[PDB]
Amino acid sequence: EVETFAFQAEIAQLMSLIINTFYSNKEIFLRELISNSSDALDKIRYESLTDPSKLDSGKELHINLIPNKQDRTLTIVDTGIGMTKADLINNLGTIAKSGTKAFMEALQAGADISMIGQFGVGFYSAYLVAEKVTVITKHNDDEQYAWESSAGGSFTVRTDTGEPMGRGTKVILHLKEDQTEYLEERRIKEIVKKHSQFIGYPITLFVEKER
Ligand SMILES: NC(=O)c1ccc(-c2nccc3c(-n4cnc(-c5ccccc5)c4)cccc23)cc1N[C@H]1CC[C@H](O)CC1
């Protein structure tokens, strides 16, 4: 049981600009995904202060970066608050619509793609490097879901039958064939050091064993 939704035309127009751009500083996608994870971890931590039971689904607060050269995927995993079905299909899109509208005008104006996160559409910077993004998430108040889009005008949402995650989010970047540098340990280390090492949670870059 998979539900397929259309994006509104202006969002669809932004995702196409992003997926098609030759903008050179594409490393900024990683800062944006890590920032979302950090926000998600803050959110559940600030919630846990009054209601301690909000961490029964996992005490550990961390971010893991998981390259897989075999599958050409970079996965960003966190144990933050996660997202509900209603977040994925409704609440997040309200912010995306408002953020999109504005950013598309600043782009006309001659603003830089790296300020995408200022307008709350930083998530879409994934398409700088990915042909498809799969978001698998578990919020305390809902079941485990997978959102996915290839920036083709639509996204799907389905119950995720896969491995239970407890609480948190995995963003799986199915990388563009010309963007495989983002699977190299040397490259990921460089970006995290430049853009993300002052994040307030441990970021663990996983190494791969022999194929
Ligand atoms: N790692 C993460 O938790 C995360 C990972 C990804 C995203 C994320 N941000 C923006 C848009 C998303 C999205 N989406 C993109 N467009 C739509 C959309 C657009 C129009 C209509 C309907 C949906 C949904 C799908 C999945 C994750 C998204 C957000 C995330 N975190 C937010 C911070 C914590 C709370 O504030 C809520 C979650």
Side-chain angles (χ1 to χ4, degrees):
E1 215 260 331
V2 171
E3 295 182 284
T4 306
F5 301 84
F7 292 109
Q8 299 92 327
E10 193 161 57
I11 291 175
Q13 177 166 220
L14 176 49
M15 300 173 72
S16 288
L17 185 149
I18 288 168
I19 209 173
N20 293 311
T21 188
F22 299 115
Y23 179 70
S24 49
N25 180 43
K26 291 179 161 66
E27 75 191 43
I28 62 118
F29 78 93
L30 179 60
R31 181 184 69 199
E32 297 299 323
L33 300 182
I34 289 173
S35 176
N36 289 348
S37 284
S38 179
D39 292 347
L41 291 152
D42 282 351
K43 200 162 286 204
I44 188 77
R45 213 178 158 191
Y46 283 107
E47 287 192 1
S48 73
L49 298 175
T50 53
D51 186 346
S53 55
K54 260 140 173 210
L55 309 167
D56 307 341
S57 40
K59 305 157 162 191
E60 292 177 334
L61 299 166
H62 61 244
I63 303 174
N64 294 323
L65 312 177
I66 309 180
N68 184 323
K69 278 171 194 212
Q70 156 85 27
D71 301 351
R72 205 208 294 157
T73 60
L74 174 57
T75 302
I76 297 87
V77 179
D78 65 74
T79 52
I81 192 157
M83 284 157 288
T84 58
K85 198 186 180 187
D87 295 327
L88 293 169
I89 294 168
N90 295 117
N91 309 317
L92 291 162
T94 307
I95 290 111
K97 189 163 184 284
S98 294
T100 287
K101 260 264 276 148
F103 178 59
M104 282 285 310
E105 229 210 295
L107 298 189
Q108 304 285 285
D112 186 75
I113 282 175
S114 80
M115 44 234 327
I116 186 169
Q118 277 229 247
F119 298 142
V121 288
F123 171 78
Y124 293 144
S125 71
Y127 295 99
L128 293 164
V129 308
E131 67 194 5
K132 183 167 77 185
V133 177
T134 311
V135 178
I136 295 158
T137 189
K138 176 63 175 75
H139 184 282
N140 277 156
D141 296 345
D142 210 343
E143 288 312 296
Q144 188 163 305
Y145 282 98
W147 177 105
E148 183 177 76
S149 180
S150 301
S154 66
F155 65 89
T156 54
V157 172
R158 78 190 69 201
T159 293
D160 186 65
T161 58
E163 161 200 311
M165 310 161 60
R167 184 198 64 257
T169 300
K170 305 183 304 186
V171 177
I172 308 169
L173 305 181
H174 306 268
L175 294 185
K176 283 165 174 183
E177 164 164 350
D178 60 345
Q179 309 289 151
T180 52
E181 64 192 89
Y182 302 104
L183 308 153
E184 300 292 341
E185 171 172 28
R186 175 170 54 109
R187 179 49 161 150
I188 301 161
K189 288 185 177 180
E190 267 159 33
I191 300 169
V192 170
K193 186 179 145 143
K194 185 176 171 184
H195 297 290
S196 300
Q197 59 170 301
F198 305 129
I199 292 291
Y201 300 98
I203 299 172
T204 302
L205 169 62
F206 286 32
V207 18
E208 301 190 80
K209 41 231 196 290
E210 292 186 0
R211 177 155 337 192

